[PDB]
mmCIF file of all heavy atoms in Angstrom:
data_model
loop_
_atom_site.group_PDB
_atom_site.id
_atom_site.type_symbol
_atom_site.label_atom_id
_atom_site.label_comp_id
_atom_site.label_asym_id
_atom_site.label_seq_id
_atom_site.Cartn_x
_atom_site.Cartn_y
_atom_site.Cartn_z
ATOM 1 N N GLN H 2 52.738 5.345 23.358
ATOM 2 C CA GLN H 2 51.369 5.015 23.008
ATOM 3 C C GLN H 2 50.567 6.315 23.026
ATOM 4 O O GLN H 2 50.456 7.007 24.055
ATOM 5 C CB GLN H 2 50.800 4.054 24.042
ATOM 6 C CG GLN H 2 49.312 3.818 23.845
ATOM 7 C CD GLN H 2 48.842 2.619 24.653
ATOM 8 O OE1 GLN H 2 48.192 2.700 25.682
ATOM 9 N NE2 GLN H 2 49.241 1.482 24.099
ATOM 10 N N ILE H 3 50.028 6.601 21.857
ATOM 11 C CA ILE H 3 49.261 7.845 21.696
ATOM 12 C C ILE H 3 47.771 7.552 21.597
ATOM 13 O O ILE H 3 47.316 6.833 20.718
ATOM 14 C CB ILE H 3 49.762 8.538 20.416
ATOM 15 C CG1 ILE H 3 51.288 8.768 20.560
ATOM 16 C CG2 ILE H 3 49.012 9.798 20.040
ATOM 17 C CD1 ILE H 3 51.875 9.234 19.238
ATOM 18 N N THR H 4 46.988 8.103 22.525
ATOM 19 C CA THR H 4 45.556 7.876 22.421
ATOM 20 C C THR H 4 45.001 8.865 21.405
ATOM 21 O O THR H 4 45.679 9.788 20.947
ATOM 22 C CB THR H 4 44.855 8.023 23.774
ATOM 23 O OG1 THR H 4 45.174 9.318 24.258
ATOM 24 C CG2 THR H 4 45.441 7.041 24.765
ATOM 25 N N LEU H 5 43.754 8.647 21.099
ATOM 26 C CA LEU H 5 43.139 9.382 20.002
ATOM 27 C C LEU H 5 41.995 10.263 20.413
ATOM 28 O O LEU H 5 41.211 10.710 19.613
ATOM 29 C CB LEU H 5 42.746 8.385 18.901
ATOM 30 C CG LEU H 5 43.951 7.671 18.252
ATOM 31 C CD1 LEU H 5 43.437 6.553 17.378
ATOM 32 C CD2 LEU H 5 44.755 8.643 17.445
ATOM 33 N N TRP H 6 41.949 10.581 21.709
ATOM 34 C CA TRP H 6 41.008 11.539 22.203
ATOM 35 C C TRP H 6 41.207 12.926 21.592
ATOM 36 O O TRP H 6 40.247 13.685 21.436
ATOM 37 C CB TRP H 6 41.115 11.678 23.713
ATOM 38 C CG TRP H 6 40.862 10.467 24.552
ATOM 39 C CD1 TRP H 6 41.762 9.827 25.373
ATOM 40 C CD2 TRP H 6 39.626 9.772 24.685
ATOM 41 N NE1 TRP H 6 41.150 8.759 25.991
ATOM 42 C CE2 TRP H 6 39.840 8.696 25.594
ATOM 43 C CE3 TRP H 6 38.361 9.909 24.143
ATOM 44 C CZ2 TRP H 6 38.828 7.815 25.939
ATOM 45 C CZ3 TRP H 6 37.356 9.043 24.482
ATOM 46 C CH2 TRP H 6 37.614 8.024 25.368
ATOM 47 N N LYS H 7 42.448 13.241 21.271
ATOM 48 C CA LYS H 7 42.783 14.485 20.613
ATOM 49 C C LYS H 7 43.570 14.165 19.356
ATOM 50 O O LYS H 7 44.007 13.037 19.132
ATOM 51 C CB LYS H 7 43.454 15.528 21.485
ATOM 52 C CG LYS H 7 44.879 15.363 21.906
ATOM 53 C CD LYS H 7 45.236 16.515 22.859
ATOM 54 C CE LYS H 7 46.546 16.265 23.557
ATOM 55 N NZ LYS H 7 46.703 17.262 24.651
ATOM 56 N N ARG H 8 43.773 15.157 18.506
ATOM 57 C CA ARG H 8 44.569 14.939 17.293
ATOM 58 C C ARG H 8 45.976 14.514 17.632
ATOM 59 O O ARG H 8 46.542 15.147 18.541
ATOM 60 C CB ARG H 8 44.661 16.184 16.404
ATOM 61 C CG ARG H 8 43.355 16.678 15.794
ATOM 62 C CD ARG H 8 43.568 17.779 14.759
ATOM 63 N NE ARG H 8 42.339 18.151 14.089
ATOM 64 C CZ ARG H 8 42.265 18.982 13.054
ATOM 65 N NH1 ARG H 8 43.337 19.545 12.550
ATOM 66 N NH2 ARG H 8 41.093 19.257 12.528
ATOM 67 N N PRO H 9 46.497 13.505 16.959
ATOM 68 C CA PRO H 9 47.857 13.032 17.263
ATOM 69 C C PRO H 9 48.931 13.847 16.569
ATOM 70 O O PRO H 9 49.573 13.493 15.589
ATOM 71 C CB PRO H 9 47.809 11.612 16.752
ATOM 72 C CG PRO H 9 46.896 11.673 15.560
ATOM 73 C CD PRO H 9 45.803 12.636 16.011
ATOM 74 N N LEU H 10 49.149 15.010 17.192
ATOM 75 C CA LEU H 10 50.113 15.965 16.725
ATOM 76 C C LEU H 10 51.465 15.742 17.378
ATOM 77 O O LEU H 10 51.520 15.466 18.570
ATOM 78 C CB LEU H 10 49.634 17.373 17.089
ATOM 79 C CG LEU H 10 48.353 17.806 16.379
ATOM 80 C CD1 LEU H 10 47.805 19.067 16.994
ATOM 81 C CD2 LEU H 10 48.650 17.989 14.891
ATOM 82 N N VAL H 11 52.493 15.846 16.550
ATOM 83 C CA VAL H 11 53.866 15.744 17.022
ATOM 84 C C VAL H 11 54.722 16.830 16.407
ATOM 85 O O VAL H 11 54.363 17.444 15.428
ATOM 86 C CB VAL H 11 54.481 14.387 16.697
ATOM 87 C CG1 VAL H 11 53.699 13.271 17.380
ATOM 88 C CG2 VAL H 11 54.524 14.155 15.184
ATOM 89 N N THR H 12 55.881 17.027 17.027
ATOM 90 C CA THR H 12 56.887 17.906 16.455
ATOM 91 C C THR H 12 57.777 17.119 15.500
ATOM 92 O O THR H 12 58.245 16.013 15.797
ATOM 93 C CB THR H 12 57.764 18.518 17.551
ATOM 94 O OG1 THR H 12 56.885 19.271 18.410
ATOM 95 C CG2 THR H 12 58.786 19.463 16.936
ATOM 96 N N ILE H 13 57.986 17.732 14.358
ATOM 97 C CA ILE H 13 58.925 17.209 13.376
ATOM 98 C C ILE H 13 60.001 18.271 13.090
ATOM 99 O O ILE H 13 59.824 19.472 13.314
ATOM 100 C CB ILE H 13 58.164 16.838 12.087
ATOM 101 C CG1 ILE H 13 57.655 18.036 11.297
ATOM 102 C CG2 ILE H 13 57.027 15.879 12.421
ATOM 103 C CD1 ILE H 13 57.067 17.814 9.926
ATOM 104 N N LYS H 14 61.101 17.771 12.581
ATOM 105 C CA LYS H 14 62.146 18.588 12.009
ATOM 106 C C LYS H 14 62.365 18.206 10.550
ATOM 107 O O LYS H 14 62.606 17.042 10.275
ATOM 108 C CB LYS H 14 63.477 18.420 12.758
ATOM 109 C CG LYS H 14 64.467 19.533 12.345
ATOM 110 C CD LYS H 14 65.717 19.454 13.201
ATOM 111 C CE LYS H 14 66.559 20.687 13.100
ATOM 112 N NZ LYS H 14 67.873 20.479 13.829
ATOM 113 N N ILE H 15 62.256 19.214 9.689
ATOM 114 C CA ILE H 15 62.345 18.988 8.271
ATOM 115 C C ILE H 15 62.989 20.243 7.689
ATOM 116 O O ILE H 15 62.579 21.359 8.016
ATOM 117 C CB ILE H 15 60.998 18.727 7.609
ATOM 118 C CG1 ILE H 15 61.153 18.587 6.093
ATOM 119 C CG2 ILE H 15 59.938 19.781 7.951
ATOM 120 C CD1 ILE H 15 59.911 18.087 5.401
ATOM 121 N N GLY H 16 63.995 20.060 6.873
ATOM 122 C CA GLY H 16 64.633 21.167 6.230
ATOM 123 C C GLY H 16 65.191 22.193 7.191
ATOM 124 O O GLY H 16 65.203 23.383 6.894
ATOM 125 N N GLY H 17 65.629 21.745 8.349
ATOM 126 C CA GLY H 17 66.165 22.626 9.358
ATOM 127 C C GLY H 17 65.143 23.356 10.187
ATOM 128 O O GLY H 17 65.484 24.138 11.066
ATOM 129 N N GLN H 18 63.873 23.117 9.913
ATOM 130 C CA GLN H 18 62.758 23.768 10.604
ATOM 131 C C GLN H 18 61.973 22.850 11.519
ATOM 132 O O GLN H 18 61.762 21.714 11.147
ATOM 133 C CB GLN H 18 61.733 24.254 9.547
ATOM 134 C CG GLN H 18 62.329 25.247 8.581
ATOM 135 C CD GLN H 18 61.382 25.866 7.577
ATOM 136 O OE1 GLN H 18 61.804 26.130 6.434
ATOM 137 N NE2 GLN H 18 60.159 26.146 7.945
ATOM 138 N N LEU H 19 61.504 23.343 12.652
ATOM 139 C CA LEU H 19 60.535 22.653 13.458
ATOM 140 C C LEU H 19 59.103 22.993 13.028
ATOM 141 O O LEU H 19 58.783 24.151 12.802
ATOM 142 C CB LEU H 19 60.728 22.991 14.935
ATOM 143 C CG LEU H 19 62.113 22.565 15.451
ATOM 144 C CD1 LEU H 19 62.345 23.072 16.858
ATOM 145 C CD2 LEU H 19 62.278 21.057 15.447
ATOM 146 N N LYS H 20 58.281 21.945 12.898
ATOM 147 C CA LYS H 20 56.899 22.086 12.552
ATOM 148 C C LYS H 20 56.066 21.096 13.369
ATOM 149 O O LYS H 20 56.572 20.117 13.877
ATOM 150 C CB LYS H 20 56.637 21.804 11.053
ATOM 151 C CG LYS H 20 57.218 22.877 10.161
ATOM 152 C CD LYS H 20 56.902 22.595 8.726
ATOM 153 C CE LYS H 20 57.381 23.670 7.764
ATOM 154 N NZ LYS H 20 56.742 24.990 8.064
ATOM 155 N N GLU H 21 54.790 21.369 13.479
ATOM 156 C CA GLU H 21 53.827 20.455 14.074
ATOM 157 C C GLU H 21 53.160 19.706 12.919
ATOM 158 O O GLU H 21 52.856 20.290 11.898
ATOM 159 C CB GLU H 21 52.866 21.240 14.929
ATOM 160 C CG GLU H 21 51.558 20.638 15.375
ATOM 161 C CD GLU H 21 50.558 21.618 15.965
ATOM 162 O OE1 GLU H 21 50.711 21.890 17.175
ATOM 163 O OE2 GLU H 21 49.621 22.130 15.298
ATOM 164 N N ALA H 22 52.945 18.403 13.112
ATOM 165 C CA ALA H 22 52.308 17.600 12.090
ATOM 166 C C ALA H 22 51.458 16.518 12.735
ATOM 167 O O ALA H 22 51.710 16.073 13.855
ATOM 168 C CB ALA H 22 53.329 16.981 11.152
ATOM 169 N N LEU H 23 50.467 16.108 11.985
ATOM 170 C CA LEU H 23 49.531 15.054 12.340
ATOM 171 C C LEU H 23 50.029 13.680 11.906
ATOM 172 O O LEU H 23 50.360 13.490 10.750
ATOM 173 C CB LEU H 23 48.206 15.500 11.733
ATOM 174 C CG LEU H 23 46.948 14.699 11.938
ATOM 175 C CD1 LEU H 23 46.422 14.719 13.334
ATOM 176 C CD2 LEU H 23 45.880 15.287 10.999
#
Side-chain angles (χ1 to χ4, degrees):
Chain H
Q2 172 166 105
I3 303 171
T4 56
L5 296 170
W6 300 116
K7 73 184 168 191
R8 296 189 174 187
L10 295 168
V11 299
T12 300
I13 71 172
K14 193 174 194 187
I15 176 170
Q18 300 185 215
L19 299 173
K20 291 182 177 299
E21 164 193 277
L23 183 69

